[PDB]
Amino acid sequence: KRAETYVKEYRDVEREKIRLQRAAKQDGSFHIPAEAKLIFLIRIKGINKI
């Protein structure tokens, strides 16, 4: 059941961003897509000379 909710939750969040963007275009205003909250870091430069 929790997987059901999450799959639906992911589905609905993406459409709201699209719907908000499209409705802003119709109105003529601008919608800020909100800053990202999660980032993934990758270290790619060794362990020497730091």
Tallying the residues shown for the chain, one arrives at 50
Tally the C-alpha atoms within 13 A of residue 15's C-alpha that lie toward its C-beta. 6
- How far is the C-alpha of 20 from the C-alpha of 14, rounded, in Å? 10
Binding of other proteins at residue 45 (CB under 8 A)?
no
Binding of other proteins at residue 37 (CB under 8 A)?
yes
Binding of other proteins at residue 29 (CB under 8 A)?
no
User: 32 or 38: whose CB is closer to other proteins?
Assistant: 38
Binding of other proteins at residue 2 (CB under 8 A)?
yes
* Residue 13 one-letter amino acid: V
Tell me how far, at minimum, the Cβ of 31 lies from other proteins, in Å.
13
